[PDB]
Amino acid sequence: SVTQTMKGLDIQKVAGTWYSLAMAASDISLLDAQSAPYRVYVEELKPTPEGDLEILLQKWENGECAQKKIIAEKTKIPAVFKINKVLVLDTDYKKYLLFCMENSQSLACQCLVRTPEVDDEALEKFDKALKALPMHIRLSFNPTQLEEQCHI
Amino acid sequence: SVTQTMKGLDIQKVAGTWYSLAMAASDISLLDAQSAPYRVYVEELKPTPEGDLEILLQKWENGECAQKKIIAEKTKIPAVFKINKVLVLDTDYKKYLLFCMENSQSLACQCLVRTPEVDDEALEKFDKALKALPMHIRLSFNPTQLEEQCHI
Ligand SMILES: CCCCCCCCCCCC(=O)O
Ligand SMILES: CCCCCCCCCCCC(=O)O
Ligand SMILES: [Cl-]
Ligand SMILES: [Cl-]
C-alpha cells in the first residue's frame, strides 16, 4: 500500500482552487486515455463543517469534459477519506498537495498545486513519494494545459 | 535538444536482443495510446558491416501488433543515426542501452535492457538522463508484459 501520510492535517486549510500538475498510476490503463478511469482533474476542494471533503473535478467522458461533484467521507484517521481510499501524503496548504487513491491493487497519485505554474520542488516531493510505489505511468501538464478544461 | 551521447560507441556490440523497459516523451500524445506514434517496442538491432543500423520493432496499428524492419542511417557522428535523429545516450552493451528519437520539437527516449527483468540501476540512469529533458509522459513495463507482443 501507500506508507506516507500528512501528520496533523488541517482539512479546512486545503479548501479552494487546485491544479492537477502531475499524475501517476500502478497500471498504464488507469491514465493512458483522456477517458481512462483515474484521469480526473481536481478544480476545487470544499471541506464540510462535519469534516467530509466535497471535490469538484473535470472528467472527459462520452467525448466531452464533464464537471463532476464527489464526496470523500472522513474516517477513523485524519489524512484518510473514503468514496476507494484517498490518502493525503503531504501538503503546505499554500503551494502543493500530494495525494493517492487506492482501491481493493489499482493506485493513482497526483501533485496538486495552487497556481498554473510548473513547481519543481513540488514535482521533486512527488517523485520522492512515488519512488516507494509500483507506478508504470506518469503524466505532467504544462501551464497552457492547466488553464484548459480537461487539460487539453 | 538532447545534450547526452555515448563516447566511443561500438555499434557492432549493440547487436542482438533488447526489451523496451521504459519509454518517455515530450508530449502525452506521442505514447498515451497502444497506436501512438512513438509507442514502438524494440526486438533486435542488426548493425550492417557498412555501419548502418537495421532495427526490428513491434508497432500496434489497425488493431494488431505488427513486426516492422527499419534502417537508421549512420551520420558524421558515431552515436547519431538518421531515419528523425536517433541518439545513443549511454550503454554497457551487456545489460542496458539508453536512446532518444527527436524530429524537426517531438522527443521520445527509451531504456532498453538485454533481459526481461526490472533493472533499477538502468531505470536510475534513464531518470538521470530524462531530468535534463522536457518530458510529460513516462511508461514502464513489467516482466510479463516484456515477454508479450506489443507488451500487452
Ligand atoms: C485531500 C485531497 C482530495 C483528493 C481528490 C481526489 C479526487 C478524486 C477521487 C476519486 C477519483 C475518481 O472518481 O476516479
Ligand atoms: C542504437 C539504438 C537504436 C534505437 C532504436 C530506435 C527504433 C525506433 C526509431 C523510430 C521509431 C518510429 O518509427 O517511430
Ligand atoms: Cl473509519
Ligand atoms: Cl551526416
Choosing from A55, A81, A85 the residue with most ligand 1 atoms within 8 A of its CB, the one to mutate for a pocket test is A55
Cell of A28: 498504464
User: Do residues B48 and B72 lie in contact, with contact meaning Cβ atoms separated by under 8 Å?
Assistant: no
User: Do residues B16 and B133 lie in contact, with contact meaning Cβ atoms separated by under 8 Å?
Assistant: no
Chain A residue numbers with beta carbons less than 8 Å from the beta carbon of B118 are: none
For A83-146, what is the HEC assignment?
Answer: CCEEEEEEECCCCEEEEEEECCCCEEEEEEECCCCCCHHHHHHHHHHHHCCCCCEEEECCHHHH
Q: Count CB neighbours of B132 within 10 A.
A: 10
Chain A residue numbers with beta carbons less than 8 Å from the beta carbon of B135 are: 140
For residue B93, what are the CA distances in angstroms to B58, B108, B128?
21, 21, 19
Closest CA to B53 of B24, B85, B27: B85
Ligand minimally distant from the alpha carbon of residue A73: 3
* Structural determination approach: X-ray
- Our answer on whether the CB atom of A57 is closer than 6 Å to any ligand 1 atom is yes
Q: Which residues pair with A139 in a beta bridge?
A: A23, B137
Please tell me the distance from the alpha carbon of residue A86 to that of residue A109, in angstroms, as a whole number. 9
Closest CA to A30 of A122, A132, A139: A139
Please tell me the distance from the alpha carbon of residue B100 to that of residue B50, in angstroms, as a whole number. 22
Measure the CA angle with vertex B101, ends B96 and B103; round to 5°: 175
Residue A82 alpha carbon to ligand 3 centre in Å? 9
Choosing from A20, A52, A99, A102 the residue with most ligand 1 atoms within 8 A of its CB, the one to mutate for a pocket test is A99
For residue A75, what are the CA distances in angstroms to A39, A79, A83, B102?
25, 9, 11, 49
Please tell me the distance from the alpha carbon of residue A130 to that of residue B93, in angstroms, as a whole number. 29
**Residue carrying C-alpha cell 516507494:** A132
User: Do residues B53 and B74 lie in contact, with contact meaning Cβ atoms separated by under 8 Å?
Assistant: yes
Please name the residue ranges forming H helices in chain B: 120-131, 143-146
Q: Touching check for B60 and chain A: CB below 8 Å?
A: no
- Residue of chain B nearest A124, judged by CA positions: B131
Q: What are phi and psi of A125, to 5 degrees?
A: -60, -40
Residue with the nearest Cα to atom 8 of ligand 1?
Answer: A40
Please tell me the distance from the alpha carbon of residue B75 to that of residue B97, in angstroms, as a whole number. 19
User: Do residues B110 and B20 lie in contact, with contact meaning Cβ atoms separated by under 8 Å?
Assistant: yes
Contact B137 A137 (CB under 8 A): yes
Contact B138 A137 (CB under 8 A): yes
Please tell me the distance from the alpha carbon of residue B50 to that of residue B2, in angstroms, as a whole number. 26
Cell of B145: 508484459
B46-54: Cβ within 8 A, 24+ apart: B46/B15, B47/B11, B47/B12, B47/B14, B47/B15, B50/B74, B51/B11, B52/B81, B53/B11, B53/B14, B53/B81, B53/B86
Resolution of the PDB structure in angstroms? 2.1
Residue A131, C-beta contacts closer than 8 angstroms, at least 6 positions apart: none
Q: Touching check for B149 and chain A: CB below 8 Å?
A: no
What superfamily would CATH give domain B11-145? Calycin beta-barrel core domain (2.40.128.20)
Closest CA to B111 of B15, B23, B17: B23
- Our answer on whether the CB atom of B25 is closer than 6 Å to any ligand 2 atom is no
Each domain of chain B, given as residue ranges in start order, spans 11-145
